[PDB]
Design an enzyme around this catalytic site. Structure first.
Site, short mmCIF file in Angstrom:
data_model
loop_
_atom_site.label_atom_id
_atom_site.label_comp_id
_atom_site.label_asym_id
_atom_site.label_seq_id
_atom_site.Cartn_x
_atom_site.Cartn_y
_atom_site.Cartn_z
N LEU A 43 1.84 23.63 51.18
CA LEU A 43 1.31 23.14 49.90
C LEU A 43 2.35 22.30 49.13
O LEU A 43 1.97 21.37 48.42
CB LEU A 43 0.73 24.30 49.05
N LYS A 47 12.64 22.95 44.49
CA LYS A 47 14.12 22.99 44.61
C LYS A 47 14.53 24.32 45.26
O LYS A 47 15.43 24.30 46.11
CB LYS A 47 14.78 22.88 43.23
N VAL A 51 6.13 26.46 49.64
CA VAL A 51 4.90 27.23 49.44
C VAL A 51 3.87 26.84 50.51
O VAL A 51 3.67 25.67 50.80
CB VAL A 51 4.40 27.06 47.98
N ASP A 154 9.98 29.45 32.65
CA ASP A 154 9.54 28.24 33.39
C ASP A 154 8.07 27.98 33.10
O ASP A 154 7.34 27.68 34.03
CB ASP A 154 9.81 28.32 34.89
O1 LIG Z 1 5.85 31.34 42.85
C1 LIG Z 1 4.76 31.86 42.79
O2 LIG Z 1 4.56 33.05 42.34
C2 LIG Z 1 3.55 31.17 43.29
C3 LIG Z 1 2.30 31.79 43.27
C4 LIG Z 1 1.17 31.11 43.69
C5 LIG Z 1 1.26 29.80 44.13
N1 LIG Z 1 0.08 29.11 44.44
C6 LIG Z 1 -0.10 27.82 44.77
N2 LIG Z 1 0.88 26.96 44.89
C7 LIG Z 1 0.38 25.69 45.16
C8 LIG Z 1 1.27 24.53 45.22
C9 LIG Z 1 0.75 23.23 45.22
C10 LIG Z 1 1.58 22.15 45.17
C11 LIG Z 1 2.98 22.30 45.14
C12 LIG Z 1 3.87 21.20 45.08
C13 LIG Z 1 5.22 21.40 45.07
C14 LIG Z 1 5.75 22.67 45.12
C15 LIG Z 1 4.92 23.76 45.18
C16 LIG Z 1 3.52 23.60 45.18
C17 LIG Z 1 2.63 24.71 45.22
C18 LIG Z 1 -0.97 25.63 45.25
S1 LIG Z 1 -1.69 27.16 44.99
C19 LIG Z 1 2.50 29.18 44.18
C20 LIG Z 1 3.64 29.85 43.77
O3 LIG Z 1 4.83 29.21 43.82
#
Ligand SMILES: O=C(O)c1ccc(Nc2nc(-c3ccc4ccccc4c3)cs2)cc1O
EC number: 2.7.11.1
Length: 327
Positions: A43, A47, A51, A154
């Site tokens: 996804l 940094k 994900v 954050d």
């Molecule tokens: O840290 C957490 O608790 C946590 C919990 C749920 C979650 N769900 C989701 N993430 C994404 C997502 C989409 C586009 C992106 C672009 C750059 C970087 C990351 C990205 C993450 C979609 S749905 C993500 C999380 O990081």
């Protein structure tokens, strides 16, 4: 040197708690089966983490797998403790499992899947009612973590996952979250630049939960004025100047004077002199339907230089701006 500061609420939540609660380094983590999860697609890469969308092959449910990077691997016990402490809380992301990634050899956090909409596309469509609704939902999560002695640090649109179809929201990414201890000096290198509070920008380390309230005000300003982000700094110094061009320089100088803060001398050639601007300047025909006297009164009560003077999350929930929201 700097005049000390304390939160005006939940000041001593962690001073009473047994060491095991806030002493995250002591906490022992039991690894689950990495094999229970099949990675589907990346996804995004941050940094500190990568994900993935994944399937829990035991229950066929969709989950999110966050694989921490080497730098963020060191601070896994703190994020895991905070997640376990807040699990089940209102609008808090639920940690389902902790596994060791076989490739990175670092920890992988498994989370409940939320059918989110890209905040860039979704803030262009929210109604006045939805803005009030979702803001109230975010406040439920902030009052909960603050009541549990935790600062998110954050708060930003990317960290608020919203399922617009089931009118559900989750506050995610507790990677920078920290336990509030009165009189503790914290790292100011937290939050995303556009949502950094003035205390971080002026290097005031003895901050508290009120930092999240400033971040929240930045999000509100972005939604009601249809300008994302509202304070568009080119860097951390320009970020303070962007704020000062709106809130004015006199109130900023009063804030630094109150806490006996020494402003970085670099600010002398870039900050200038700016009167506080009335919100009408940001109001145009395309956003007037999102702006009300209650919205501006609420925004003025979040967007204050003095962190001690900002509404707390619980006080915010009492604001007239939310009287229209079905509770
Ligand atoms: O840290 C957490 O608790 C946590 C919990 C749920 C979650 N769900 C989701 N993430 C994404 C997502 C989409 C586009 C992106 C672009 C750059 C970087 C990351 C990205 C993450 C979609 S749905 C993500 C999380 O990081």
């Amino acid at each position: 040197g700097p005049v000390p500061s304390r939160a005006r609420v939940y000041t001593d939540v962690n001073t009473h708690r047994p060491s095991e609660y806030w002493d995250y380094e002591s906490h022992v983590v039991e690894w689950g089966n990495q094999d229970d999860y099949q990675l589907v697609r990346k996804l995004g890469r941050g940094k500190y983490s990568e994900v993935f969308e994944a399937i829990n092959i035991t229950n066929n449910e969709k989950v999110v797998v966050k694989i921490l990077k080497p730098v963020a691997a060191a601070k896994i016990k703190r994020e895991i403790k905070i997640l376990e402490n807040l699990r089940g809380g209102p609008n808090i992301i639920t940690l389902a499992d902790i596994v060791k990634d076989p490739v990175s050899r670092t920890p992988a956090l498994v989370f409940e899947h939320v059918n989110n909409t890209d905040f860039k596309q979704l803030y262009q469509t929210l109604t006045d009612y939805d803005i009030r609704f979702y803001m109230y939902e975010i406040l439920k999560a902030l009052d909960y973590c603050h009541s549990m002695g935790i600062m998110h640090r954050d708060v930003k649109p990317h960290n608020v996952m919203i399922d617009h179809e089931h009118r559900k929201l989750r506050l995610i990414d507790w990677g920078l979250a920290e336990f509030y201890h009165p009189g503790q000096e914290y790292n100011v290198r937290v939050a995303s630049r556009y949502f950094k509070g003035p205390e971080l920008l002026v290097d005031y380390q003895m901050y508290d939960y009120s930092l999240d309230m400033w971040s929240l005000g930045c999000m509100l300003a972005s939604m009601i004025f249809r300008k994302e982000p509202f304070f568009h700094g080119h860097d951390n110094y320009d970020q303070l100047v962007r704020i000062a061009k709106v809130l004015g320089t006199e109130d900023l100088y009063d804030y630094i004077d109150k806490y006996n803060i020494e402003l970085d001398p670099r600010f002398n050639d870039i900050l200038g002199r700016h009167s506080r601007k009335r919100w009408e300047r940001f109001v145009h025909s395309e956003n007037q339907h999102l702006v009300s006297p209650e919205a501006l009164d609420f925004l003025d009560k979040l967007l204050r230089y003095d962190h001690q003077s900002r509404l707390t999350a619980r006080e915010a929930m009492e604001h007239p701006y939310f009287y229209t929201v079905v509770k």
